[PDB]
Amino acid sequence: EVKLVESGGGLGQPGGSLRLSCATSGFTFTDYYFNWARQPPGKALEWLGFIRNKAKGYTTEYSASVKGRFTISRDNSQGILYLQMNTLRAEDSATYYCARWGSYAMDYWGQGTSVTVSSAKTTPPSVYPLAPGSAAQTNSMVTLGCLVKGYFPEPVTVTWNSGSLSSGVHTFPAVLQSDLYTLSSSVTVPSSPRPSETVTCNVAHPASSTKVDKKIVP
Amino acid sequence: DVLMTQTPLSLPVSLGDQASISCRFSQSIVHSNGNTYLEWYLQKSGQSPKLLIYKVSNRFSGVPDRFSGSGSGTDFTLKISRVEAEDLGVYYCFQGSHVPRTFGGGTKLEIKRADAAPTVSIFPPSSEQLTSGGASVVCFLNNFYPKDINVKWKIDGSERQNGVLNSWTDQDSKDSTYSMSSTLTLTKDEYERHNSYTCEATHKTSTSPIVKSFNRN
Numbered sequence: 001e002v003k004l005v006e007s008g009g010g011l012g013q014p015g016g017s018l019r020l021s022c023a024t025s026g027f028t029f030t031d032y033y034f035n036w037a038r039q040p041p042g043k044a045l046e047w048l049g050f051i052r053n054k055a056k057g058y059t060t061e062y063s064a065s066v067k068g069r070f071t072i073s074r075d076n077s078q079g080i081l082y083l084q085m086n087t088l089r090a091e092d093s094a095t096y097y098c099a100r101w102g103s104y105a106m107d108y109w110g111q112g113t114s115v116t117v118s119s120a121k122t123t124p125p126s127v128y129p130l131a132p133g134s135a136a137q138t139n140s141m142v143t144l145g146c147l148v149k150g151y152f153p154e155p156v157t158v159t160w161n162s163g164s165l166s167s168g169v170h171t172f173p174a175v176l177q178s179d180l181y182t183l184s185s186s187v188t189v190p191s192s193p194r195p196s197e198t199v200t201c202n203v204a205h206p207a208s209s210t211k212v213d214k215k216i217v218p
Numbered sequence: 219d220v221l222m223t224q225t226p227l228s229l230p231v232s233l234g235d236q237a238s239i240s241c242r243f244s245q246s247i248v249h250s251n252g253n254t255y256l257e258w259y260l261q262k263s264g265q266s267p268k269l270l271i272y273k274v275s276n277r278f279s280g281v282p283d284r285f286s287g288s289g290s291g292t293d294f295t296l297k298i299s300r301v302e303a304e305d306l307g308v309y310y311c312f313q314g315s316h317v318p319r320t321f322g323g324g325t326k327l328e329i330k331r332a333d334a335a336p337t338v339s340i341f342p343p344s345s346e347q348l349t350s351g352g353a354s355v356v357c358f359l360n361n362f363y364p365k366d367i368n369v370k371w372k373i374d375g376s377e378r379q380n381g382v383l384n385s386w387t388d389q390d391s392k393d394s395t396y397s398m399s400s401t402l403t404l405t406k407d408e409y410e411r412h413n414s415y416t417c418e419a420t421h422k423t424s425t426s427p428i429v430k431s432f433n434r435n
């Protein structure tokens with residue numbers, strides 16, 4: 001089977017370096033051009049550059065976004081492709097993919113390797129209850145939530161009443177804020193069931209070994 | 219250089235309908251050897267991109283015949299007849315023969331449903347956060363359709379731009395709607411200097427904006 005395996009991902013330091021590898025097997029490596037592409041979480045797939053085959057002398061082409069800062073190389077004896085990323089920036093946080101190119105274009109892709117460029121350190125999040133104001137008209141349904149603020153690294157998990165409340169739940173994608181992540185989650189229940197029935201968000205941040213059960217009090 | 223334009227960004231469709239995606243160029247990309255290296259790829263949520271069509275109209279082995287690429291010189295088309303659930307994801311046209319070598323902006327295939335106004339809910343800062351010196355005001359704008367929506371924050375009636383962070387969900391697998399969350403983050407000091415906090419939303423479902431507010435007092 002044709003195989004491409006990316007590796008080397010992890011947390012990179014801003015201003016630092018990182019070399020990603022793409023190990024191949026199952027076909028003649030030197031017959032192929034190879035491409036590197038990246039997809040930032042919540043963003044579009046982006047082409048980075050390619051290295052040509054033996055017939056083309058293994059020359060390279062790069063995107064304007066990284067030319068002069070990234071380097072693509074290949075070890076023809078080992079059948080391994082590399083992506084040398086220098087002076088890491090936050091914009092480099094993404095999942096990186098390698099793919100061969102030939103008569104059948106990019107017919108085989110690797111599974112990708114994730115990179116996160118940050119100087120932050122592990123940090124538990126602060127979990128805040130989101131309850132409607134004292135003055136706020138009644139309703140058939142009531143929406144409550146939890147703001148999970150300032151954690152690192154990703155991710156965090158949020159459940160409601162230990163997963164008992166699954167329907168009507170919206171946990172939003174995290175965003176970077178003050179060099180840390182922030183996320184919120186909403187739950188909607190009929191107005192008659194609360195506060196008579198407790199609603200608690202269960203937020204877990206495994207990297208910092210934290211689990212917080214925050215009750216939504218009126 | 220050649221400019222590539224892939225449209226549309228978003229493509230709402232109903233299962234069973236055909237979908238057509240466009241890739242156009244500011245000039246011809248036919249190579250002197252006679253070939254045209256215009257390719258089409260699909261990237262499903264949480265997955266690697268996969269080839270669909272190479273050299274304009276060559277369907278890659280294993281791709282259902284429902285998919286087909288066409289086009290000529292400067293205008294290219296990916297057609298998907300009888301769309302099914304498996305086809306949902308982001309389609310990208312690509313060419314690496316002309317500068318800028320690149321993928322298109324992408325076309326997210328999504329499900330068509332009836333227009334639905336958002337359920338907007340605003341929330342004041344919790345005492346826990348306040349005690350820590352910060353004040354975040356949250357506004358959920360849940361289950362609306364279509365996806366386009368605009369949110370405005372106002373404090374004491376004046377519009378507020380600084381400190382606002384937004385997040386958006388992918389289309390709901392179950393009801394095909396979209397949801398949004400906006401948070402205005404202030405210091406306790408600034409929060410205690412103002413009284414009126416408003417989250418206002420405009421959506422195609424109404425000419426009137428949806429306004430939700432709370433007063434510190």
Ligand SMILES: O=C(O)CCCCN(Cc1ccc([N+](=O)[O-])cc1)CP(=O)(O)O
Binds near residue numbers: 033052249255315
């Ligand atoms: O050399 C051949 O016969 C095949 C390539 C034909 C021309 N190519 C087209 C071409 C080559 C590489 C890619 N890719 O994404 O990797 C895309 C398009 C450009 P070049 O001569 O290498 O600059």
